[PDB]
Write a protein that binds this ligand. Structure first.
Ligand SMILES: Oc1ccc2c(Cc3ccc(CN4CCCC4)c(Br)c3)c(-c3ccc(OCCN4CCCC4)cc3)sc2c1
Ligand SMILES: *[C@@H]1O[C@H](CO)[C@@H](O)[C@H](O)[C@H]1NC(C)=O
Ligand code: NA
Ligand code: NA
Lengths: 28, 250, 12
């Protein structure tokens, strides 16, 4: 899908969820 | 989900609930990959050892939910299935190799703030993110412990585990079509999917384009959150050719 | 607990 994986309430508004930083910090 | 936490509203808009018509009950998790296709584990639909063999008419797919038991009026959408496709080489007799199935909805579902598809990985995304130590996310309305039920969708983040470690934790023969995940007994952190969560998505957020990708499908485990044991997931990219085949042809 | 009743339209 064109906009697959971009969440209306998060990525689209540029807001981050409570624990996504945990994932990103694990990607060396 | 064992040792997880309540999900935020709209946190996993691709999460789908596989719901049995009668008796009305939660069977498994699943994921929305387009307006008319849902991805899940083959074992959710077919597993002879447990006398399981559901057809299109036996169940419903509920999308956009948060609460496990409530009928979320004006928020969730319930759909009927047109057809179910199970991998021709799904190995239920031995190790659940190629534990994957596709379901075609009778009519497309309209997207909303709560309903939105997840991306399928490309070879490059899989190569870059499917590495030991890298964390993924699992969501579901499954049991809170091996041996109760959550009120709302639960979430837990888990690190992918080195293939040798996965292999040495079980007697089951593992294939290239699976990967395992979970914390090690010494890491001082727990978490795992559990009964009712299987068939659900294991996702990762690409640091390159900020999109969420479904890297795995909750497939099998021995117990839930047992030390020295790990959850096994279907390698979605490895089976993408089959996925595209079904969708393109049907 | 058990599940809440869903519209009949979805059960036919
Ligand atoms: O991290 C994970 C990853 C996957 C799973 C699964 C799926 C899972 C686990 C194990 C198997 C069996 N394995 C044999 C070797 C490889 C497959 C299958 Br299929 C699927 C769990 C589960 C456990 C019990 C259950 O119903 C009990 C209730 N039943 C009593 C008998 C019938 C009803 C339903 C789901 S818990 C769990 C944690
Ligand atoms: C499962 O159900 C299908 C469709 O009703 C049937 O064709 C098949 O014989 C059943 N058993 C197995 C093991 O597929
Ligand atoms: Na082994
Ligand atoms: Na474990």
């Amino acid at each position: 899908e064109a906009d697959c994986g971009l969440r209306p309430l998060f990525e689209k508004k540029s807001l981050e969820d409570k624990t996504e930083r945990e994932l990103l910090e694990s990607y060396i | 989900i064992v040792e997880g936490s309540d999900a935020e509203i709209g946190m996993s808009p691709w999460q789908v609930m596989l719901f049995r018509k009668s008796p009305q009950e939660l069977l498994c998790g699943a994921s929305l990959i387009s307006d008319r296709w849902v991805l899940t584990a083959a074992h959710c639909l077919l597993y002879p050892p447990w006398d399981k063999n559901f057809t299109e008419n036996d169940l419903l797919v509920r999308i956009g939910k948060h609460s496990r038991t409530r009928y979320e009026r004006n928020i969730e959408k319930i759909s009927m299935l047109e057809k179910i496709y199970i991998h021709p080489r799904y190995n239920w007799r031995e190790n659940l190799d190629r534990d994957i199935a596709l379901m075609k909805l009778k009519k497309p579902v309209a997207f909303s703030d709560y309903i939105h598809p997840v991306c399928l990985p490309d070879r490059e995304t899989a190569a870059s993110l499917l590495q030991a130590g890298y964390k993924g996310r699992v969501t579901g309305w499954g049991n809170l412990k091996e041996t109760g039920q959550p009120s709302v969708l639960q979430v837990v983040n888990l690190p992918i585990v080195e293939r040798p470690v996965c292999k040495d934790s079980t007697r089951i023969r593992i294939t290239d079509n699976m990967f395992c995940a979970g914390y090690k007994p010494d890491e001082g952190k727990r978490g795992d999917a559990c009964e009712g969560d299987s068939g659900g998505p294991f996702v990762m957020k690409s640091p390159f384009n900020n999109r969420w990708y479904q890297m795995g499908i909750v497939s099998w485990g021995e117990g839930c959150d047992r030390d020295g044991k790990y959850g096994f997931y279907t390698h979605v990219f490895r089976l993408k050719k089959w996925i595209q085949k079904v969708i393109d042809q049907f | 607990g058990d599940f809440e009743e869903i519209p009949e339209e979805y059960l036919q």
